């Protein structure tokens, strides 16, 4: 619950390093800032400025410390650390509309960029003439791609877009990857192949956030209908949906095998349970109000949360997770503190 007012401005995205000592936020402009924790204070560190547009996606790899940035100026940069200073390297995208989201691969050889030109760019590294080569996944995508996530076997990719559907592609480059094994999602996996296309027919909303699991056999996505849904591939590829009574949610992540944490326009993270038989049940809001004209909403965030990321090791075991908001903050929540404080809250 440790707030830190970094700014008085919105933060688009943020990323952490391996030691959890540096952060990389963007103060809603054409610059990227890095902060360093020392003592009990956060001091501004080396600043990055190459975009003439507006940075929308920032990702930091855990190993080799390379930072990828993409923005609204249809361009992508890879920043590498040398002798105290960060230097950029250009990535050609062959894109003509925008770039909206970016994520590294788990084995740090490719990275995926969503775009507003109805395609997904998978970029890999060519050291024969030392640049980055992009490949495109186009069909069938009929709208703007909003969210991506990588499966933990360096092959499959999950994409949610504005055509009210969530779909799983197979991004596989023969030069930089080995032969994949069989998955419960599918068996034949060439490049650009669709594995499944979940989505609500008839009624539907824009998919804001997708997430895989630690085992890689369960997928979850949220929508603009204030609905959260979990698809299981092992149980004959089925889907379980849940309609909430709150405002729509923007970011989501599996925090375990059978628990999911979400956040959004309600300013408060919430917890949902998914049993093995298959039932999505609302459990509790994590930010309980304290037992204690200014409006003064009884919530630690004063505006909409746009990102939820894990803070303690990985998806296999979680004890802390982090949130960033439009009011400008960085809140670290603790599971062992929230276990004793809220009666009846049983995290699995």
């Amino acid at each position: 619950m440790s707030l830190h007012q970094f700014l008085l401005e919105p933060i688009t995205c943020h990323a952490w390093n391996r030691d959890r000592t540096q952060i990389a936020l963007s103060p809603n402009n054409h610059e990227v800032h890095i902060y360093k924790k020392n003592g009990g204070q956060w001091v501004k560190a080396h600043e990055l400025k190459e975009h003439n547009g507006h940075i929308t996606g920032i990702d930091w790899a855990p190993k080799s410390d390379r930072i990828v940035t993409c923005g609204a100026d249809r361009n992508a940069y890879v920043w590498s650390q040398k002798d105290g200073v960060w230097k950029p390297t250009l990535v050609i995208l062959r894109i003509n509309r925008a770039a909206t989201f970016v994520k590294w691969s788990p084995l740090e050889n490719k990275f995926a960029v969503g775009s507003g030109a109805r395609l997904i760019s998978v970029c890999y590294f060519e050291s024969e003439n030392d640049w980055w080569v992009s490949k495109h996944i186009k069909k069938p995508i009929r709208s703007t791609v909003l969210s991506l996530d990588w499966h933990p076997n360096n092959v499959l990719l999950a994409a949610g877009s504005c055509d009210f559907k969530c779909r799983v592609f197979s991004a596989y480059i023969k030069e930089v990857d080995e032969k994949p094994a069989s998955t419960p999602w599918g068996s034949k996996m060439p490049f650009g192949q669709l594995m499944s296309e979940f989505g609500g027919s008839g009624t539907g909303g824009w998919v804001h956030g997708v997430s895989f699991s630690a085992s890689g056999s369960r997928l979850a996505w949220v929508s603009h209908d204030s609905t959260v849904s979990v698809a299981d591939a092992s149980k004959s590829v089925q889907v379980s949906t849940l309609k909430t009574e709150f405002l729509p949610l923007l970011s989501v992540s599996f925090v375990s095998e059978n628990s999911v944490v979400a956040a959004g326009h309600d300013c408060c993270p919430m917890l949902f349970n998914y049993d093995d038989r298959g039932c999505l049940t609302f459990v509790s809001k994590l930010d309980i109000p304290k037992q204690s004209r200014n409006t003064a909403l009884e919530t630690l965030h004063q505006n909409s949360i746009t990102q939820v990321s894990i803070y303690e090791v990985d998806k296999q075991d979680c004890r802390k997770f982090c949130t960033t908001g439009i009011d400008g903050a960085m809140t670290i929540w603790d599971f062992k503190t929230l276990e004793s404080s809220i009666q009846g809250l049983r995290i699995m």
Binding site: S182, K188, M189, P190
Partner: peptide, 4 residues
């Protein structure tokens, strides 16, 4: 090419 993609039998398996």
């Amino acid at each position: 090419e993609w039998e398996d």
